Enzyme design. Structure first.
Site, short mmCIF file in Angstrom:
data_model
loop_
_atom_site.label_atom_id
_atom_site.label_comp_id
_atom_site.label_asym_id
_atom_site.label_seq_id
_atom_site.Cartn_x
_atom_site.Cartn_y
_atom_site.Cartn_z
N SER A 1 -29.14 28.66 88.51
CA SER A 1 -28.79 28.48 87.50
C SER A 1 -27.22 27.39 88.14
O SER A 1 -26.70 27.71 88.68
CB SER A 1 -27.77 29.44 86.92
OG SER A 1 -28.87 30.26 85.81
N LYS B 1 -27.51 27.47 79.85
CA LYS B 1 -28.78 26.93 81.37
C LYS B 1 -30.14 27.03 80.70
O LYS B 1 -31.71 26.46 81.19
CB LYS B 1 -29.27 27.13 82.44
CG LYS B 1 -27.60 26.37 82.82
CD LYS B 1 -27.13 26.48 84.90
CE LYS B 1 -25.78 25.81 85.43
NZ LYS B 1 -25.19 27.09 84.95
N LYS C 1 -32.15 35.51 81.67
CA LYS C 1 -30.85 34.23 82.51
C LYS C 1 -30.21 35.42 82.26
O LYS C 1 -29.23 36.16 80.99
CB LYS C 1 -30.87 33.85 81.27
CG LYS C 1 -29.65 32.84 81.84
CD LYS C 1 -30.25 30.72 83.13
CE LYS C 1 -30.80 31.29 84.09
NZ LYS C 1 -31.19 30.42 85.15
N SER D 1 -23.32 30.63 81.12
CA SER D 1 -24.21 29.79 82.66
C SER D 1 -25.76 30.32 81.42
O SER D 1 -26.47 29.58 81.81
CB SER D 1 -24.78 30.57 83.70
OG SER D 1 -24.02 31.55 83.89
#
Length: 343
Positions: free
Chosen positions: A98, A45, A201, A42
């Protein structure tokens, strides 16, 4: 000598790859397997948000604009078709949670289609000079082949902060409300009282392990860490915290010369004035061992023995050398700060 010239040992990091860079200078403070291609899961993203941030910066759309969801029902986790959501809410779903649905909705809204959005993602990869990153989807799910690296992810983090500050500001939000429902930021380090973390993130997947790109500040200093293939749950935040902490302990970022400030003057021949103001056209940031600032020395060499007009603004006329312990650690073009017409 011995203490002022020591190279600090690097902490052990329980992950497959990592990097620690300074946001302003780009200096790599530490690294292991930073260019090895891995599945960022992820972290992808982060690029999705980057593209969205660029679109909003260009004024393609704004946070108040409503997005209509298009073509699961048992989970308030999936976005339902026909549902109308403000951009402000969709981008927080992406940045804080996310959310996969939000990525797709924003992709269509910003670029017309997911595949076109991915094209933009890969165009930015190339614009940023990333050599080990390629994307397939806007969310990083049906894309067994997506890859990036510790270095490239840190660099994407740096670009977010640098190029789209309004988008980056959202990452420190601990909480937000998606259609009446409170949702948390998944980046646990935001709650850490020891560091001033404000991004970026975190992700995990069985295939890719634990992944986190983090950024923290201390004074005007900012570091970015990317730790990929984190091996354990207990290290998911701890390993990066260790790295960032170490960075701040042993290194310091200085700004010896700002753009437009006069580093030196030199006589000018045949001109409209007899004196040229010399400096740089880009700020100089240097990352050196903490406590060495007083030993930092700067000097310059001209390209020719004399300067003759005409001289354009920002014309390169020499080299500024920054040194520590007699080692030139940085070289920059020395430029004319003010135009000097022939006269």
């Amino acid at each position: 000598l011995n203490i002022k010239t020591m190279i600090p040992g690097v902490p052990q990091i329980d992950a497959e790859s990592y990097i620690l860079i300074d946001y302003n200078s780009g200096k790599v403070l530490a690294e292991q397997n930073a260019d090895v291609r891995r599945d960022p899961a992820s972290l992808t993203k982060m690029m999705t948000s980057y593209v969205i941030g660029q679109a909003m910066k260009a004024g393609k759309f704004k946070e108040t604009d409503l997005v209509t969801i298009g073509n699961k029902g048992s989970s308030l986790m999936f976005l339902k078709p026909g549902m109308q959501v403000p951009v402000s809410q969709l981008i927080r779903d992406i940045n804080l949670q996310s959310g996969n649905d939000a990525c797709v909705a924003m992709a269509d809204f910003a670029a017309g289609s997911q595949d076109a959005f991915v094209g933009l993602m890969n165009s930015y990869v190339n614009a940023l000079g990333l050599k080990n990153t390629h994307f397939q989807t806007v969310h990083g799910l049906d894309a067994d082949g997506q890859y990036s690296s510790a270095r490239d992810m840190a660099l994407i983090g740096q670009a977010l902060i640098r190029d789209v500050p309004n988008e980056y500001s959202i990452y420190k939000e601990k909480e937000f409300t998606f259609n009446g429902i409170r949702q948390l930021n998944r980046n646990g380090l935001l709650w850490d009282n020891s560091l001033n973390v404000d991004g970026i993130k975190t992700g995990h997947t069985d295939k890719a392990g634990y992944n986190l790109v983090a950024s923290a500040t201390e004074g005007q200093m900012r570091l970015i860490s990317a730790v990929m293939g984190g091996r354990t749950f207990k290290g998911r935040e701890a390993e990066s915290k260790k790295l960032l902490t170490w960075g701040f302990r042993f290194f310091e970022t200085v700004n010896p010369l700002k753009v437009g400030k006069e580093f030196a003057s030199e006589p000018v021949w045949f001109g409209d004035s007899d004196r040229a103001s010399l400096g740089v056209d880009k700020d100089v940031y240097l990352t050196i061992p903490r406590g060495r600032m007083k030993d930092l020395k700067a000097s310059y060499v001209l390209n020719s023995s004399e300067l003759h007009a005409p001289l354009q603004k920002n014309q390169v006329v020499g080299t500024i050398n920054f040194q520590l312990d007699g080692k030139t650690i940085e070289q920059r073009p020395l430029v004319v700060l003010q135009e000097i017409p022939e006269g």
